[PDB]
Short mmCIF file of C-alpha atoms in Angstrom, two decimals:
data_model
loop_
_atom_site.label_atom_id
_atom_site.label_comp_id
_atom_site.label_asym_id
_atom_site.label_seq_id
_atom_site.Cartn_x
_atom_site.Cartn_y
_atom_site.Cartn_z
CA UNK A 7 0.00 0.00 0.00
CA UNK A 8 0.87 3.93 -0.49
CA UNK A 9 -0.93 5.93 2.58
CA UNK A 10 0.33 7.69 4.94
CA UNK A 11 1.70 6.05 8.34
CA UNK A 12 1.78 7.37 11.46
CA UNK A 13 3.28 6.13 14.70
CA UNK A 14 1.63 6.50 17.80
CA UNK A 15 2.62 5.57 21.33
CA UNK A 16 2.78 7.48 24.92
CA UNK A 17 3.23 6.07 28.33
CA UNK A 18 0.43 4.40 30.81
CA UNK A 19 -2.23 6.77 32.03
CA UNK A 20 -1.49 9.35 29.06
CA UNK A 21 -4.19 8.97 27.15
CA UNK A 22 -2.46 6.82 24.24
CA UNK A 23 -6.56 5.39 23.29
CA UNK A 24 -7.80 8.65 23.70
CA UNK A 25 -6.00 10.27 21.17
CA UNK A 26 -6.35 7.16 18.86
CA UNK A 27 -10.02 7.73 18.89
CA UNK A 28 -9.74 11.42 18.28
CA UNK A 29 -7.69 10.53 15.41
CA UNK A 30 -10.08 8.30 14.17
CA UNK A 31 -13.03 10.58 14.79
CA UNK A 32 -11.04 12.48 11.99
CA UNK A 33 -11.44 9.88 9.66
CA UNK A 34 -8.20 8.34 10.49
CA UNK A 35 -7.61 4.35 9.78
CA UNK A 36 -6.15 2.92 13.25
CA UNK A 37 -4.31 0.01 13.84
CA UNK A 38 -4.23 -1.33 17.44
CA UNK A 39 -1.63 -4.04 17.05
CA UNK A 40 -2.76 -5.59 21.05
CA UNK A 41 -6.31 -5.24 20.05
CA UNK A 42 -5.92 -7.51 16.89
CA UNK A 43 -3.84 -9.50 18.75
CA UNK A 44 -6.72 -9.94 21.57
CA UNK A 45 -9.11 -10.19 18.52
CA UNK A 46 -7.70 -13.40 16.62
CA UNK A 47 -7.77 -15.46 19.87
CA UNK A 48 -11.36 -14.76 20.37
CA UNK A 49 -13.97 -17.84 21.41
CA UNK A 50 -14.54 -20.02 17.76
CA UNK A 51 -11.28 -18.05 16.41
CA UNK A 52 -9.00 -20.68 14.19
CA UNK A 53 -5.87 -19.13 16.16
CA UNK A 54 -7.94 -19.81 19.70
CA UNK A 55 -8.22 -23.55 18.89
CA UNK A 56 -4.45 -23.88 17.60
CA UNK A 57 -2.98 -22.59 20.48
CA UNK A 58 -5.61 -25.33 22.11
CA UNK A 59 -3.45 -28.19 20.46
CA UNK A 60 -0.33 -26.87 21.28
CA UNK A 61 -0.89 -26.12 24.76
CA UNK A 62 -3.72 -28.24 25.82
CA UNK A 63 -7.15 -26.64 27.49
CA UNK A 64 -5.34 -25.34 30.87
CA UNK A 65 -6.28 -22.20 29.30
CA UNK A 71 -11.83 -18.12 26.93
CA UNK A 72 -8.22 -17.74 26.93
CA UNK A 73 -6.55 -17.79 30.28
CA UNK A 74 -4.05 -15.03 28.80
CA UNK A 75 -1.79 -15.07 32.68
CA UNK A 76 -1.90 -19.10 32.36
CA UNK A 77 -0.70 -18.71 28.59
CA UNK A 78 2.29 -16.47 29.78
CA UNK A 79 3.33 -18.89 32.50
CA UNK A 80 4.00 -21.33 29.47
CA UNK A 81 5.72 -18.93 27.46
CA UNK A 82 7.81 -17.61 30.44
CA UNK A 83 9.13 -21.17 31.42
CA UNK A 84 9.73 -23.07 28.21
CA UNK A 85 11.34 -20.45 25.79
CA UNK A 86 10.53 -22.66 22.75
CA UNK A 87 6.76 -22.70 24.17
CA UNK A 88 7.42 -18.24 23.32
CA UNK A 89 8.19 -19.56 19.58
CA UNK A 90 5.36 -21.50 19.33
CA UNK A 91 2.58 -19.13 20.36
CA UNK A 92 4.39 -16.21 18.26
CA UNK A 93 3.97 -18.64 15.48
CA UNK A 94 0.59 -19.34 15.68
CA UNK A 95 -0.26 -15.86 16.38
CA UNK A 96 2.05 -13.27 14.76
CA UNK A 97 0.39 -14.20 10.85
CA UNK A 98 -2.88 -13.92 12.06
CA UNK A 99 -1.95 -10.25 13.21
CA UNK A 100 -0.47 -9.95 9.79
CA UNK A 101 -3.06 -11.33 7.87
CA UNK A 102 -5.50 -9.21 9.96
CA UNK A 103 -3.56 -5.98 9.71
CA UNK A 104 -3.36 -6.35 5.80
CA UNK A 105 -7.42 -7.31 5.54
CA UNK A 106 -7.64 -3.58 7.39
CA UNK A 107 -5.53 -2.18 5.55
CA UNK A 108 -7.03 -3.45 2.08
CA UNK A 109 -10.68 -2.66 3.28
CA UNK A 110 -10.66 1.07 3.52
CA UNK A 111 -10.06 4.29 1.74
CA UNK A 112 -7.12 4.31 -0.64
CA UNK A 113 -6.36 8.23 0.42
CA UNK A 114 -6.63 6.79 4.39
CA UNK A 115 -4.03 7.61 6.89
CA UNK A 116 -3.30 4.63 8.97
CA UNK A 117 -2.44 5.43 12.42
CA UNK A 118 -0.62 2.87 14.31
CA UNK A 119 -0.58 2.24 18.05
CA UNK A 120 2.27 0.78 18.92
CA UNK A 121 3.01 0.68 22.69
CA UNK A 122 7.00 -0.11 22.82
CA UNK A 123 7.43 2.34 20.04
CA UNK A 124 10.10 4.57 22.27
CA UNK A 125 11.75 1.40 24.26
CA UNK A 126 12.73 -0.64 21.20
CA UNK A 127 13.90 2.49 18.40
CA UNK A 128 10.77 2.05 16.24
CA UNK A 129 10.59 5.59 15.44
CA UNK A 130 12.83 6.01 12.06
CA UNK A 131 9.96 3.22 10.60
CA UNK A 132 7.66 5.82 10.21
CA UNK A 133 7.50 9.20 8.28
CA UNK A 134 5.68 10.85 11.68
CA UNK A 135 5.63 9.96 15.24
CA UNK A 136 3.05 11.57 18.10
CA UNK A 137 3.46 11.24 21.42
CA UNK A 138 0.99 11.68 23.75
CA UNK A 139 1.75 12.96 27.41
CA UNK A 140 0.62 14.49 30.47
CA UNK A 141 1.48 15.58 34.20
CA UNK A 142 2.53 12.80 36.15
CA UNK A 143 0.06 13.88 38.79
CA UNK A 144 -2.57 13.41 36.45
CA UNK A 145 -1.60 10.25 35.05
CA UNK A 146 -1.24 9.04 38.47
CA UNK A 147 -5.19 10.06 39.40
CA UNK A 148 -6.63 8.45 36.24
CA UNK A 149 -4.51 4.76 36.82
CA UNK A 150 -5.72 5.05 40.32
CA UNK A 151 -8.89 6.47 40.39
CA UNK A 152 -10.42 5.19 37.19
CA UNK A 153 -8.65 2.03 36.67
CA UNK A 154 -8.19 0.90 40.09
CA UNK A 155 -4.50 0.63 40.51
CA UNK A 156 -2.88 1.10 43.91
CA UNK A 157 -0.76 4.09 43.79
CA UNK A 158 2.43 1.89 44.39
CA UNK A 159 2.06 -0.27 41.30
CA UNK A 160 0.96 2.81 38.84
CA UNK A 161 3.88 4.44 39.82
CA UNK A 162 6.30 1.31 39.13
CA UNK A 163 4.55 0.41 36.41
CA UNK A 164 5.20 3.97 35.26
CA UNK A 165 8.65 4.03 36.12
CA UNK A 166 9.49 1.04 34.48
CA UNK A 167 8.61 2.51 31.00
CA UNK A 168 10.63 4.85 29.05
CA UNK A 169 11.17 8.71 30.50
CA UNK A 170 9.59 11.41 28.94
CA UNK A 171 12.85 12.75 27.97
CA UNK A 172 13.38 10.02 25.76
CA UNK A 173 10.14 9.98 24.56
CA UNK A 174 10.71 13.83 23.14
CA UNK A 175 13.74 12.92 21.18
CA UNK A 176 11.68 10.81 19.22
CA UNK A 177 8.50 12.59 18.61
CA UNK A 178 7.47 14.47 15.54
CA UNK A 179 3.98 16.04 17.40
CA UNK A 180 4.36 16.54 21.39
CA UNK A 181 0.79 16.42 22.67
CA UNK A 182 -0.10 17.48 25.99
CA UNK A 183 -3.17 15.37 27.43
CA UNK A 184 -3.22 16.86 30.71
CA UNK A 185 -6.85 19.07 30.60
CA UNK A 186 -10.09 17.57 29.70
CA UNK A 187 -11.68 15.01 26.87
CA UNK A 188 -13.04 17.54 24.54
CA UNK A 189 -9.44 19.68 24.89
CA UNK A 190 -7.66 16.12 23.55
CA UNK A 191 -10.34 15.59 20.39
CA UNK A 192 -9.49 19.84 19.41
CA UNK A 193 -5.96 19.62 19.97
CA UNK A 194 -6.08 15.95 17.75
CA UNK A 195 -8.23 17.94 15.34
CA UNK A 196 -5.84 21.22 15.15
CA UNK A 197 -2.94 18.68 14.16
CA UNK A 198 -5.22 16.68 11.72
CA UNK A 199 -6.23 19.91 10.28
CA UNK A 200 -3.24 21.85 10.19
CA UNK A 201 -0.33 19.07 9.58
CA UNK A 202 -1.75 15.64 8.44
CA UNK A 203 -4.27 16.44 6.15
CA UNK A 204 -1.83 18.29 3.77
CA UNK A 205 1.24 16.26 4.57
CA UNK A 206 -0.97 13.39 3.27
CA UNK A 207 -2.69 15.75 0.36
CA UNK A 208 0.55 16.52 -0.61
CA UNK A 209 2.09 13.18 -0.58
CA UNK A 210 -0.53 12.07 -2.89
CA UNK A 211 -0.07 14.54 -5.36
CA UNK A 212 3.85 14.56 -4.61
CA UNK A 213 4.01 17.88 -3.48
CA UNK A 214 6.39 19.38 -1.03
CA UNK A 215 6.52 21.82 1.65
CA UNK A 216 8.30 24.55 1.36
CA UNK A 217 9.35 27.42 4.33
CA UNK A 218 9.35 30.88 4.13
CA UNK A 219 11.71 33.26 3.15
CA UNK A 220 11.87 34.83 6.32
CA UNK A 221 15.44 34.32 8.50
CA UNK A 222 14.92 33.36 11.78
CA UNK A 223 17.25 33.12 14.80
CA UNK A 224 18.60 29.55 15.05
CA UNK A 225 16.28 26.98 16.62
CA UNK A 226 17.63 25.21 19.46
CA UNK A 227 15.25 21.95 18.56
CA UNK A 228 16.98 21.83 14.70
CA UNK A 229 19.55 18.77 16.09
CA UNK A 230 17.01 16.86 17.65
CA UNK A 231 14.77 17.44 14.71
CA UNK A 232 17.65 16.22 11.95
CA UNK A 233 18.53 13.17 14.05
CA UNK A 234 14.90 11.89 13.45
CA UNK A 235 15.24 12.94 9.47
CA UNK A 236 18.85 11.40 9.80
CA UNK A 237 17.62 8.24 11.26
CA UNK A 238 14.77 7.73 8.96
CA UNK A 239 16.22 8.46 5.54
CA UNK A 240 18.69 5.70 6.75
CA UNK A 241 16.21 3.40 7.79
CA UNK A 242 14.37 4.23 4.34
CA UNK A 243 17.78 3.59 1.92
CA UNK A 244 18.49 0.47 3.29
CA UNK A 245 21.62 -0.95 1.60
CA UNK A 246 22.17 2.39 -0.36
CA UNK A 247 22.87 5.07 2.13
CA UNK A 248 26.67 5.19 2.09
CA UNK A 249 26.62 8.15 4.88
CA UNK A 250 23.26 10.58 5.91
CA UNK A 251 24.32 14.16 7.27
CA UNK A 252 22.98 17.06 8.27
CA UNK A 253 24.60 19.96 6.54
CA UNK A 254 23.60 23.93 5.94
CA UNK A 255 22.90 26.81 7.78
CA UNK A 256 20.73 24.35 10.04
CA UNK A 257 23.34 22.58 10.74
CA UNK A 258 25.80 24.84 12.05
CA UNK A 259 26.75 25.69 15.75
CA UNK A 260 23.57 27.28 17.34
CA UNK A 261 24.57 31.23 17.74
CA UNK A 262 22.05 33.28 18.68
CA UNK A 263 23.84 36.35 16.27
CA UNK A 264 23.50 33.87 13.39
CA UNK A 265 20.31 33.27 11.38
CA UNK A 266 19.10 31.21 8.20
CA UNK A 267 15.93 29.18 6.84
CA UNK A 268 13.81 27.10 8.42
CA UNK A 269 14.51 24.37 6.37
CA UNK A 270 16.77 21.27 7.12
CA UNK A 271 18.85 20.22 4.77
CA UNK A 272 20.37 16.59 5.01
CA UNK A 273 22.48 14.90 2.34
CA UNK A 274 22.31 11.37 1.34
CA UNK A 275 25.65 9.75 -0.13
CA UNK A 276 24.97 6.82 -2.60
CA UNK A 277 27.22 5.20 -4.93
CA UNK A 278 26.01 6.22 -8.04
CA UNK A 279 23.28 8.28 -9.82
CA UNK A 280 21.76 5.02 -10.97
CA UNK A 281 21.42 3.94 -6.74
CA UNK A 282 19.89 7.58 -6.32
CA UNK A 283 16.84 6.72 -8.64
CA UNK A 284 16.37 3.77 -7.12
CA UNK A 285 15.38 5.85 -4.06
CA UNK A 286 12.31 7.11 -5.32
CA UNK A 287 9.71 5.07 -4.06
CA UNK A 288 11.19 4.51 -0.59
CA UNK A 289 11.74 8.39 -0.30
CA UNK A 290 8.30 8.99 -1.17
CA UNK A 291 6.65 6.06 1.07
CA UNK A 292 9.28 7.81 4.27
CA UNK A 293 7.16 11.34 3.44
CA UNK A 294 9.47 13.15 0.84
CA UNK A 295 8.44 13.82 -2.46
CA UNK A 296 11.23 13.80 -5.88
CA UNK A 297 11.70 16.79 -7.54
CA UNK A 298 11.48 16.14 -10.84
CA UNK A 299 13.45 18.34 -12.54
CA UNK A 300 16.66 19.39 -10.19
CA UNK A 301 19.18 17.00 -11.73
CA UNK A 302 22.57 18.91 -10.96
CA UNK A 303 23.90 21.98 -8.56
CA UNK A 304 25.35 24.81 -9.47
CA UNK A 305 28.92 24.06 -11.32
CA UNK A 306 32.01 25.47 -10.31
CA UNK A 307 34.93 25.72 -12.41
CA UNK A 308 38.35 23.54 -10.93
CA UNK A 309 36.39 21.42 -8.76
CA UNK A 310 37.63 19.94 -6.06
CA UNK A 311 37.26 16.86 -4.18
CA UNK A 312 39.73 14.89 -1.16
CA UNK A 313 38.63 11.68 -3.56
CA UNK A 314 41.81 11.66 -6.53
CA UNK A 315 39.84 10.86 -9.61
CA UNK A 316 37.53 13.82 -8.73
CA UNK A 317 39.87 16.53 -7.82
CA UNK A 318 40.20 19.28 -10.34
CA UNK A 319 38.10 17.99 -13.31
CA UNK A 320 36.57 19.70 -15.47
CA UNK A 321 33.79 17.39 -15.97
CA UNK A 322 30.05 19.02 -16.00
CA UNK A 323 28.61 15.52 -15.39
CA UNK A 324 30.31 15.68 -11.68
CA UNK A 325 27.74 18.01 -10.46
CA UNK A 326 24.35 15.80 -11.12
CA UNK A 327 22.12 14.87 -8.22
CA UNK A 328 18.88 14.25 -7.34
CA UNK A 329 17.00 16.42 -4.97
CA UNK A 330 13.43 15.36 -2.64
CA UNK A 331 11.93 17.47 -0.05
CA UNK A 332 9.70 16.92 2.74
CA UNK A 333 5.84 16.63 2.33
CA UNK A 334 4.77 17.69 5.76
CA UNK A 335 4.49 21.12 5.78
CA UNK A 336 5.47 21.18 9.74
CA UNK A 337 9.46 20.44 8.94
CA UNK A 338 10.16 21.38 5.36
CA UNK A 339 13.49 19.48 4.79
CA UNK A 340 15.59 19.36 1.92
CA UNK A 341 16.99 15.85 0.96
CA UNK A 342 20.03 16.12 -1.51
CA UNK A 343 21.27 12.76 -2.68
CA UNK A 344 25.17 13.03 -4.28
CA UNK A 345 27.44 10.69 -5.31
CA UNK A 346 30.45 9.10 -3.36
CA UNK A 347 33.40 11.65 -3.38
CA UNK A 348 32.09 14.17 -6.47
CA UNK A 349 32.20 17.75 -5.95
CA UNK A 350 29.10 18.52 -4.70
CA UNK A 351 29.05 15.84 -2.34
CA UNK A 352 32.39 16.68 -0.87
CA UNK A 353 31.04 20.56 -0.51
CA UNK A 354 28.19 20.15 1.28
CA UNK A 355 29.97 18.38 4.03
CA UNK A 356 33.10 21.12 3.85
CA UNK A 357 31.01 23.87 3.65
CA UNK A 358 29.48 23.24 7.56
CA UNK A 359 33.15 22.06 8.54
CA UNK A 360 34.79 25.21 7.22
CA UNK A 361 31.91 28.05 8.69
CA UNK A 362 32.01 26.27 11.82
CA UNK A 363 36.11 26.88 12.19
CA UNK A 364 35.93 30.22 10.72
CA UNK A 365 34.08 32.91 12.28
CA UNK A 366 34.97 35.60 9.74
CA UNK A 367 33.37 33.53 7.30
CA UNK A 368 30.20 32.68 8.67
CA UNK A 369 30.06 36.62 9.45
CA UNK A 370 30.12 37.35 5.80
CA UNK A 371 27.82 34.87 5.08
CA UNK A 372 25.20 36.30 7.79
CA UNK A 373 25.00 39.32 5.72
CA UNK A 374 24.80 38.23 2.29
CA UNK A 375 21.75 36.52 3.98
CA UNK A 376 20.60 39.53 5.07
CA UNK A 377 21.04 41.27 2.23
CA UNK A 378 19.30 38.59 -0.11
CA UNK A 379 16.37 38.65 2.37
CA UNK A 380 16.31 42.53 2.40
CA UNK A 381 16.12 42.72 -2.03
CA UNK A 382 13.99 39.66 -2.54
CA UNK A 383 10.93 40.97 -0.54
CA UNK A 384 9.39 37.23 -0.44
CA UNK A 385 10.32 36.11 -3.52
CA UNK A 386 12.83 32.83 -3.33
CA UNK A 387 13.94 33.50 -6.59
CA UNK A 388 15.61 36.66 -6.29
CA UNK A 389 16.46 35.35 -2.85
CA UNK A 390 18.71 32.80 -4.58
CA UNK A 391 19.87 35.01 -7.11
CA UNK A 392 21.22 37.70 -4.67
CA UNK A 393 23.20 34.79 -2.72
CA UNK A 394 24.29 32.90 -5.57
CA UNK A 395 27.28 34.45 -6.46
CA UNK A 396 28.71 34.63 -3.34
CA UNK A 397 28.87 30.66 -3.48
CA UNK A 398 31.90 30.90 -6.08
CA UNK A 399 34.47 33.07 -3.62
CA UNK A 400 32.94 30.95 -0.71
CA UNK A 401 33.78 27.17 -3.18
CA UNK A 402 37.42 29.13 -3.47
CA UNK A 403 38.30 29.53 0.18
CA UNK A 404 36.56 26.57 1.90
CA UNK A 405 38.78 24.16 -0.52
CA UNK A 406 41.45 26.73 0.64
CA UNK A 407 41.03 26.04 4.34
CA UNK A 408 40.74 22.55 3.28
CA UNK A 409 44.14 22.58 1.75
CA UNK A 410 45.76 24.11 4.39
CA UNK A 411 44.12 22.39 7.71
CA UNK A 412 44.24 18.60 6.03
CA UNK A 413 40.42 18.35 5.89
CA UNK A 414 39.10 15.08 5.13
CA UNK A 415 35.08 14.75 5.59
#
């Protein structure tokens, strides 16, 4: 299938079902992995009476008699997941096939933090609230004893790492119909044109505006990083974050809000293979960006690509985000050619150099103050500035032994 996947997890008592359903109430497709799980062992289920013959009737299902089996024999654990794992799967795809082909699937998954699930999915919300108020909801409408909520809560990952990992951060700590408008507001504002825009292979693109540098960019291009890795599979040589995003956070500086990460494959021909991956991870080709800017004497710390004169050297291919909460730029070079080596220099080099990213600042500036809006002339006022910066970043490079 092509839709839109979202994961979805949050800790005990923070409203993890809640939000599903106010998801879903937006016309959302969920998948509850422990409620199809609880679904295919059901009375007159064909996975009920298997796990009948391989266990016997000591176990409705007697689901803590099951896990006494499973704990004890280890091979007994194989078993059951045999038996029940394809019915999940088979279950999961019968969803999946039944509904809408513009749904987004939402999936509930409630390990999604503990075991590094995250990079799976193109967008990852995390439900959480106070833990006072998770604490009175386990206890007071569940029945818990405060001692075991708060083990049970401790036992489970912190919210700290839960943050580093989430694309939406969703406060559930005020009432019901605060949860369905906040779930709404996202739906509305972020997942209805992320997935519009996937289908029609659109991307987002920021402002023109500068802005002061964002102390969340790092965080937020270690889940890109992570998930364009997890997306190339074999072909990723190397995933980085490079550009004005990427740069020492200085409160003086300024740039974009856009993240730009490089991919480094092997070839062009590995690039194009990337396209459907790319655009099933949430970023869109753009069609017709098949090279950078040339310089002349280009340079790379590879031999066979050091000062060549070769136009062919500076082809690429070029995606960009669909969700129009982080646009992101995803430039995908090949293995030691000029523009690959640049891009990684280029952060290297302003980050040693002070001068340099001083000049830099105000051409910004400058191209922000002429081009009124307009990208365009945006580019066109920094563009030339490029060729002196090409000349002394390969200088520096010379001189201080760089190798990326």
């Amino acid at each position: 299938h092509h839709m839109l996947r979202i994961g979805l997890t949050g800790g005990i008592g923070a409203g993890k079902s809640a939000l599903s359903s106010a998801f879903a109430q937006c016309g959302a497709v969920i998948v509850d992995g422990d409620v199809i799980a609880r679904e295919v062992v059901r009375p007159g289920t064909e996975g009920l009476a298997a796990l009948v013959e391989a266990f016997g009737r000591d176990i409705s299902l007697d689901r803590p008699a099951l896990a006494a089996k499973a704990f004890a024999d280890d091979a007994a654990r194989q078993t059951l997941n045999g038996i029940v794992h394809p019915l999940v799967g088979a279950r999961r795809a019968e969803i999946i096939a039944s509904v809408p082909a513009d749904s987004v699937v939402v999936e509930d998954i409630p390990l999604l933090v503990e075991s590094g699930m995250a990079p799976l999915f193109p967008l990852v919300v995390i439900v959480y609230a106070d833990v006072e108020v998770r604490l009175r909801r386990l206890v007071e409408q569940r029945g818990m004893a405060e001692a075991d909520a708060r083990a049970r809560i401790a036992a489970q990952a912190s919210d700290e790492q839960r943050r580093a990992v989430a694309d939406i951060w969703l406060d559930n700590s005020g009432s019901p119909a605060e949860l369905v408008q906040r779930a709404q507001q996202v739906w509305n504002e972020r997942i209805v044109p992320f997935a519009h825009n996937l289908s029609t292979r659109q991307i987002a693109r920021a402002p023109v505006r500068l802005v002061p540098p964002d102390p969340e960019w790092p965080a937020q291009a270690q889940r890109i990083v992570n998930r364009l890795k997890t997306a190339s599979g074999h072909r990723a040589l190397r995933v980085d974050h490079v550009g004005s995003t990427a740069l020492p956070g200085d409160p003086d500086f300024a740039a974009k809000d856009v993240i730009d990460i490089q991919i480094t494959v092997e070839s062009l021909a590995a690039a194009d293979e990337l396209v459907e991956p790319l655009l099933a991870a949430g970023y869109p080709r753009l069609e017709h960006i098949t090279a950078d800017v040339a310089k002349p004497d280009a340079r790379s710390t590879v031999e066979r690509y050091d000062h060549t004169g070769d136009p062919a050297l500076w082809h690429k291919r070029i995606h960009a985000s669909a969700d129009p909460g982080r646009p992101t730029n995803v430039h995908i070079r090949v293995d030691g050619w000029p523009g690959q080596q640049f891009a990684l220099l280029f952060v290297d080099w302003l980050t040693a150099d002070p001068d340099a990213r001083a000049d830099y600042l105000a051409v910004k500036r400058s191209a922000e103050q002429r081009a009124d809006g307009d990208i365009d002339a945006y580019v066109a006022v920094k563009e030339p500035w490029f060729r002196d910066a090409y000349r002394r970043a390969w200088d520096w490079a010379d001189s201080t032994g760089w190798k990326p």
